[PDB]
Amino acid sequence: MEPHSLRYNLMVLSQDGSVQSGFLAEGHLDGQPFLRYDRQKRRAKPQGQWAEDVLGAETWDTETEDLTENGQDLRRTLTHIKDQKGGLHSLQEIRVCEIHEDSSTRGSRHFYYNGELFLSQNLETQESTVPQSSRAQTLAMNVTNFWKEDAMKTKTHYRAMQADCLQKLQRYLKSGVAIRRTVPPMVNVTCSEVSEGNITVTCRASSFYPRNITLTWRQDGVSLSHNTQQWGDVLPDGNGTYQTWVATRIRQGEEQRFTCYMEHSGNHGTHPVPS
């Protein structure tokens, strides 16, 4: 429905015509922050005891080594992007990892210069996408030429980049840093619009995380034709969790035949119509 992802936000800058040392960086897992680089103490640190109490130094050592390498390359591309130039200059790289359900993966790398995109790389196919802008094409052409020669891009060491956060993504999911935020949905079935030989039944799942959920009514066991029911967007219900519902109209007296089948986070549950 929505896959697992590992995102990093890297940034280098220069405030007076001199690229500042180090860099800035953020790591988010499935939408949530877990890493934050300390430019001064030169360490990758957790963004909470949550990440602090689950991840060990082995992880922070690795992320610190990796990100630092990242920072050198970025600072080097920036030096090049200006020729001397002066004043403010900024270069950010958003890199993302994705694992879907079919186990197919995705991976991208986006580069912004002074607040504007100018290059995107699909790490799974290695094709790049430059915005159809003049200034953005000049940039892309320079930065890419510069990468192939005196090569701090190097081959498909990019294909390794993809396998790298992917391995980390899998590792972090395994460590559980993301599963602790799991909240099984509160189920609640309601009978409404009681009327002319009819009565509506509504299955409401609320206060649950993550967002991926499946809900459907069943007549004696079979899923109702996708139409004969009405679903609601998966709206943010409350305080970080989500909510949604499905409904369908039935004939008064045959409540026993209907059940609401739900699936959330690998957990399948069955809910009957109220008495």
- Inter-residue contact 177 to 50 (CB < 8 Å): yes
Residue with tokens 């949604």: 244
CB atoms within 10 A of CB 40: 8
Cα–Cα distance for residue pair 194/91, rounded to 1 Å: 61
Residues 6+ apart with CB under 8 A from 134: none
Cα–Cα distance for residue pair 201/190, rounded to 1 Å: 6
**Half-sphere exposure (CA, 13 Å, Cβ side) for 26?**
10
Domain ranges of the chain: 2-184, 185-273
**Domain 2-184 classified CATH 1.10.645.10?**
no
Residue with tokens 């994705």: 98
Tokens of 268: 């399948």
Long-range contacts of residues 187-193, Cβ cutoff 8 Å, at least 24 apart: 187/260, 187/262, 187/269, 187/271, 189/260, 189/271, 189/272, 189/273, 189/274, 190/274, 191/255, 191/273, 191/274, 192/247, 193/249
Counting Cβ atoms within 10 Å, is residue 134 exposed (0-12), middle (13-18) or buried (19+)? Answer: exposed
Helix 57-81 vs helix 159-174: crossing angle, to nearest 10:
150
**Domain 185-273 classified CATH 3.10.20.30?**
no
Cα–Cα distance for residue pair 71/63, rounded to 1 Å: 12
